């Protein structure tokens, strides 16, 4: 009975753990978009001045 | 001795995404750095022209 509930508990850890590191992929992937916006901008704006 | 296996193998496979997630945590800390620093260089640059 307490080998079953902690493979229970340890699986729920795990579905959360891994529902955390797909939202930590999802900003990093933000950011990156965000990175290049900023990038072209300094492109752009070097040619400008 | 089964459910102790099994266990063990979740507990190998949990441990490997929390090294996943604070790798990732510490890209994210990395990349907002770059974007907030490539903002200010914007308003500095448009300033200027």
Same mark, same amino acid.
């Given at each position: 009975?307490?080998?079953?509930?902690? @493979?229970? +508990? #340890?699986?729920?850890?795990?579905?959360?753990?891994?529902?955390?590191? %797909?939202?930590?992929? $999802? =900003? @990093?992937? +933000? #950011?990156?978009?965000?990175?290049?916006?900023?990038?072209?901008?300094? %492109?752009?704006?070097? $040619? =400008?001045?």
């Amino acid at each position: 009975s307490a080998k079953e509930s902690a @493979l229970v +508990k #340890l699986h729920l850890e795990q579905q959360r753990i891994e529902k955390e590191k %797909e939202t930590l992929k $999802a =900003e @990093l992937q +933000k #950011l990156r978009q965000q990175a290049l916006e900023t990038k072209h901008f300094i %492109e752009k704006q070097e $040619a =400008e001045e």
